[PDB]
């Protein structure tokens, strides 16, 4: 879809005629912690303690 076939006569890996987007368009990261997606059962501190116990005693 891009265009004509280009052979190895083009030395550069990225030909000049291609388009490079500016820095404005590129989306920026959201460098903040977001709320955890956790269900009711696993949000129970007792269940968390059970998970830790299983991890550090049998796993």
């Amino acid at each position: 879809v891009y265009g004509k076939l280009i052979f190895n006569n083009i030395k550069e890996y990225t030909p000049s005629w291609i388009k490079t987007i500016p820095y404005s368009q590129v989306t920026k990261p959201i460098l903040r912690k977001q709320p955890q997606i956790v269900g009711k059962i696993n949000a129970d501190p007792k269940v968390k303690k059970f998970w830790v116990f299983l991890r550090e005693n049998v796993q």
């Binding site: 879809v1 190895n8 550069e12 030909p15 005629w17």
Partner: protein, 327 residues
């Protein structure tokens, strides 16, 4: 034994039947371009004879279930016909001959983009089946028409023939595989091939070939010898082109728009000796500039380059800063 002078050769292959072997100048194997053969065969099949009549009657079905079917499937995945017709899936996946040709000649991008276009869709398809490409990708997919894709296909096929397929000479061969299976072990290649038995020598003249008249006819107007210098001929050509445009939604024009016949007539007149002032100067200038740009080969400008890395050993692998007078 000599295959020539065998009993069959002595009896049947004789001057009386015009079956004699004629020795001429040595010539390369694969002397006929496959693309040219297909073009001439297509013209003979579709635009001549009862076969032409039948294939013209069935044209709506072929367009519906072959062209539009493929185009719809490709658009669903954000791909164009170029993604399948230019390089077959098999060639992109595993074929070694195409791999060698691409490595020796092609630029990495030509195949990199082809693979990444499918990677886009398939990364999601494998995760969740039934993926439909959104409109923003579909639009850029639909931007490219079939004219440029066929230009690329013809260029690639002609290049492959002229460079590599024109530099081959097949030989009698056994099973290439090293399998101990007797079925595969005793496979015999070289017989039951028409090329093997038609000509025993590289000097023998080629008996069968499309006549120059057939080639010239195939190079004529694809829509059936319309007179572009007459009003009735122009009207017939226009109706034929309009029905073709309707049949092929994304071949030469977007489905919404319509074909511009004045520019095409200007192109044809400029290509041929015929010329006059009946064409607007702006139209002539635009046509000439577009014709120049279409065949122009893109070239690198050598600008907007990134710094070349010159790595140096880390500090902990280098001598410490302090140094005094030894002795």
């Amino acid at each position: 034994v000599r295959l020539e002078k065998i009993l069959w050769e002595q009896l049947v292959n004789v001057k009386a039947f015009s079956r004699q072997r004629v020795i001429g100048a040595p010539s390369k194997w694969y002397n006929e371009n496959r693309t040219e053969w297909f073009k001439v065969a297509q013209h003979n099949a579709f635009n001549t004879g009862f076969s032409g009549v039948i294939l013209r009657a069935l044209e709506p079905l072929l367009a519906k279930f072959i062209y539009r079917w493929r185009l719809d499937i490709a658009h669903q995945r954000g791909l164009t016909l170029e993604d399948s017709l230019l390089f077959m899936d098999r060639e992109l996946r595993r074929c070694y001959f195409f791999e060698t040709v691409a490595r020796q000649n092609l630029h990495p991008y030509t195949v990199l983009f082809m693979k990444k276009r499918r990677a886009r869709y398939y990364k999601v398809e494998r995760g969740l089946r039934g993926f439909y490409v959104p409109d923003w990708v579909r639009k850029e997919a639909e931007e490219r028409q079939l004219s440029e894709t066929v230009d690329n296909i013809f260029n690639w096929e002609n290049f492959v023939y002229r460079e590599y397929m024109s530099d081959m000479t097949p030989i009698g061969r056994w099973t290439s595989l090293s399998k101990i299976t007797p079925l595969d072990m005793f496979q015999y290649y070289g017989l039951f091939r028409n090329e093997a038995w038609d000509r025993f020598f590289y000097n023998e003249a080629f008996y069968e070939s499309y006549s120059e008249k057939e080639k010239q006819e195939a190079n004529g107007n694809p829509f059936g010898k319309f007179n572009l210098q007459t009003a009735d001929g122009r009207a017939q050509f226009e109706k034929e082109v309009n029905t073709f445009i309707e049949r092929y939604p994304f071949a030469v024009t977007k489905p919404g728009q319509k074909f511009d016949f004045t520019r095409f007539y200007a192109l044809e007149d400029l290509a041929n000796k015929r010329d006059t002032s009946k064409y607007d100067p702006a139209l002539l200038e635009s046509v000439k500039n577009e014709l120049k740009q279409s065949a122009a080969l893109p070239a690198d400008n050598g600008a907007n380059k990134t710094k070349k890395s010159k790595p140096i050993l880390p500090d902990w692998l280098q001598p410490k800063f302090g140094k005094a007078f030894q002795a």
